[PDB]
Amino acid sequence: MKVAVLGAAGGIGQALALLLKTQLPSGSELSLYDIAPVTPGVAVDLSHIPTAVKIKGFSGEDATPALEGADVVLISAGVFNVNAGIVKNLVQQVAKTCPKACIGIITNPVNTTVAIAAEVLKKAGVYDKNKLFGVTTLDIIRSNTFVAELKGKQPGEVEVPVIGGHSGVTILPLLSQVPGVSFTEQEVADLTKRIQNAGTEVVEAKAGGGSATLSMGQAAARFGLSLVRALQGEQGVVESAYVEGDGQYARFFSQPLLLGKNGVEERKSIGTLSAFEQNALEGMLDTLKKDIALGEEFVN
């Protein structure tokens, strides 16, 4: 399997690339692309780690050599304005060079950029709804951390379902579904708010000087590695991502996905919702739909 990271020179890209270099299956390939001219040496830096993952890096305006042969494309470039055009340009190159790959959109605003990517793929005539993913995994590992801390559980043992979108009120952690624990009314309210604003914690703690890069690299790595396990034939691999699903709530929606050799193998039910969660779901959907329309309109 060959994984291409676009935007590999930024904070998220370098963290992601480091984890993939050390954790992808032996015999994989990792290609790094970023407009920053340092990118070939980010790959050379990583190439000195003795794992059986061949890694090369590319800069300039042409992402094609990084995308040659790619099976998975993870897109972390950017910093709406500028990121809309970057995602559009880069998905255009993906559609021309490796249209059969699975595409993981990390570039935010994920709610909207996944829609941009969809429309660019549709105009290219190669759009496969089962191969376009909004990487929401950072919401899940955050929820796992906060619930484990509150409830005195081991962090690696707690898994919190999170559905919906990837920003603010559209992020819906399903605390009612966490096995073995229950939450008071205040704890639901506090936990949900913290999860929906967790990125702001880092910004304030960085004194406004940066954003979440290292935890985001870890979350993208978790998704990217599960996806590759599935594309190599492992079964029972379930991960949540923002995908063009059936559309019962919105055109794109994050829900549990059984992954397979062709991307999404099955969109799984979001399951039973508490009255709090059903109400938060209904309250955010207009915002989520307008995030989606913004991305559709950028391209069309």
Query: Which one is catalytic: 2, 21, 131, 166?
Result: 166
Of 45 and 128, nearer to Ag ion (C-beta) is 128
Q: What is the closest distance, in whole angstroms, from the C-beta atom of residue 231 to Ag ion in the complex?
A: 6
Contact set for Ag ion, span 61-80 (CB under 5 A): none
Q: 106 among the known binding-site residues?
A: yes
Q: What is the closest distance, in whole angstroms, from the C-beta atom of residue 286 to Ag ion in the complex?
A: 32
Does position 212 bind Ag ion by CB under 5 A? no
Stretch that binds Ag ion, among 17-25, 46-54, 107-115, 258-266 (CB under 5 A): 258-266
Contact set for Ag ion, span 118-177 (CB under 5 A): none
Stretch that binds Ag ion, among 250-258, 261-269, 274-282, 286-294 (CB under 5 A): 261-269
| SS (HEC) of the chain | CEEEEECCCCHHHHHHHHHHHHHCCCCEEEEEECCCCCHHHHHHHHHCCCCCEEEEEECCCCCHHHHCCCCEEEECCCCCHHHHHHHHHHHHHHHHHCCCCEEEECCCCHHHHHHHHHHHHHHHCCCCHHHEEECCHHHHHHHHHHHHHHHCCCHHHCCCCEEECCCHHHEEECHHHCCCCCCCHHHHHHHHHHHHCHHHHHHHHCCCCCCCCHHHHHHHHHHHHHHHHHHCCCCCCEEEEEEECCCCCCCEEEEEEEEECCEEEEECCCCCCCHHHHHHHHHHHHHHHHHHHHHHHHHC
Of 102 and 292, nearer to Ag ion (C-beta) is 102
What are the Cα distances from residue 110, in Å, to 135, 137, 218? Answer: 8, 12, 17
Contact set for Ag ion, span 98-127 (CB under 5 A): 102
Q: 262 among the known binding-site residues?
A: no
Site string for Ag ion, 83-102 (x = CB under 5 A): -------------------x
Tell me whether residue 166 is one of the annotated catalytic residues.
yes
Residue count of the chain:
300
Of 2 and 222, nearer to Ag ion (C-beta) is 2
Does position 241 bind Ag ion by CB under 5 A? no
Backbone angles phi, psi at 110, to 5 degrees: -50, -40
Stretch that binds Ag ion, among 88-96, 153-161, 184-192, 260-268 (CB under 5 A): 260-268
Q: 216 among the known binding-site residues?
A: yes
Q: What is the closest distance, in whole angstroms, from the C-beta atom of residue 72 to Ag ion in the complex?
A: 6
Q: What is the closest distance, in whole angstroms, from the C-beta atom of residue 90 to Ag ion in the complex?
A: 17
Work out the number of other CB atoms within 10 angstroms of the CB of residue 50. 7
Q: What is the closest distance, in whole angstroms, from the C-beta atom of residue 74 to Ag ion in the complex?
A: 12
Contact set with Ag ion (CB under 5 A)? 102, 263
Residues annotated as catalytic are 166
Binding site, annotated residues for NAD(+):
7-13, 34, 83, 106-108, 216
